[PDB]
Design an enzyme around this catalytic site. Structure first.
Site, mmCIF file in Angstrom:
data_model
loop_
_atom_site.group_PDB
_atom_site.id
_atom_site.type_symbol
_atom_site.label_atom_id
_atom_site.label_comp_id
_atom_site.label_asym_id
_atom_site.label_seq_id
_atom_site.Cartn_x
_atom_site.Cartn_y
_atom_site.Cartn_z
ATOM 1 N N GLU A 1 2.404 1.754 11.312
ATOM 2 C CA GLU A 1 1.315 0.803 11.101
ATOM 3 C C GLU A 1 0.591 0.410 12.402
ATOM 4 O O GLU A 1 0.090 -0.725 12.525
ATOM 5 C CB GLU A 1 1.822 -0.461 10.394
ATOM 6 N N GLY B 1 0.866 -1.182 0.000
ATOM 7 C CA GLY B 1 0.000 0.000 0.000
ATOM 8 C C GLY B 1 0.893 1.218 0.000
ATOM 9 O O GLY B 1 1.734 1.360 -0.909
ATOM 10 N N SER B 2 0.750 2.103 0.997
ATOM 11 C CA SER B 2 1.493 3.364 0.954
ATOM 12 C C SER B 2 2.993 3.131 1.085
ATOM 13 O O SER B 2 3.777 3.990 0.660
ATOM 14 C CB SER B 2 1.039 4.337 2.039
#
EC number: 4.3.2.7
Length: 229
Positions: free
Chosen positions: A111, A10-11
């Site tokens: 995260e 993802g990012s």
């Protein structure tokens, strides 16, 4: 200590770990990427939570009818017959031993919102520079019998179906309305999706596909600029 290989899907593809020294395109077999993790701290708020990416393993997909239906809807390989039919693209980063401890702590905080740390196999898509710099390592990795690519064990952050922030299964209509309008301290939820799709679209990985992400972006774009206010 050892260095660490960290997989981004993802990012982390476009906002990388600090201090990495290798960055290799990676084919993740046996997982689907879905925007089924809510974001109350980065791309949305407690009042209006956003959606960010998580990986869903095959072994969880086959345990809920809604998951299996959704993966078949968006996959060219429908019906999905085996874990290798699920393909997600990402990149793997190498953090050398001198920085691995600190980068691990940064990524654990980055995260924090419901992701846990796991180890998964990925198939490497190397270029000639990778092969020049890492050839001695690549030669020691197993070659996958079907794909012919070198297989690498890499750490990865995953919002499991059990975590407090998991909202799946969710229909594309609901996910897209949220992404179209949510916005958090990190920026709009739209920017997170658009930059991820661009970072994947701009990767020199050719057809040798899960259409979810491009379908999602198309739906988000239709909902964009059509809010009640």
């Amino acid at each position: 200590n050892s260095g660490i290989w960290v997989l981004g899907y993802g990012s982390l593809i476009y906002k990388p770990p600090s201090h990495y020294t290798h960055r290799i395109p990676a084919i993740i077999h046996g997982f689907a990427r879905r925007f089924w993790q809510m974001s109350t701290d980065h791309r949305g708020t407690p009042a209006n939570p956003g959606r960010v990416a998580t990986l869903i393993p095959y072994e969880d997909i086959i345990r809920q009818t809604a998951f299996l239906k959704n993966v078949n809807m968006y996959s060219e390989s429908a019906p999905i017959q085996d874990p290798d039919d699920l393909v997600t693209i990402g990149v793997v980063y190498y953090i050398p031993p001198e920085h691995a401890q600190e980068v691990r702590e940064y990524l654990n905080v980055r995260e924090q919102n419901g992701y846990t740390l796991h180890e998964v196999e990925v198939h490497l898509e190397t270029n000639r520079e990778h092969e020049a710099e890492l050839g001695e390592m690549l030669e020691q990795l197993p070659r996958h019998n079907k794909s012919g690519k070198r297989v690498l064990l890499t750490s990865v952050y995953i919002g499991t179906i059990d975590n407090e922030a998991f909202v799946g299964p969710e229909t594309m209509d609901e996910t897209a309305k949220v992404i179209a309008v949510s916005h958090g301290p990190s920026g709009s939820n739209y920017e997170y999706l658009a930059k991820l799709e661009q970072a994947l679209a701009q990767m020199p990985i050719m057809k040798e596909t899960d259409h979810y992400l491009t379908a999602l972006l198309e739906t988000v774009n239709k909902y964009r600029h059509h809010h009640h206010h």
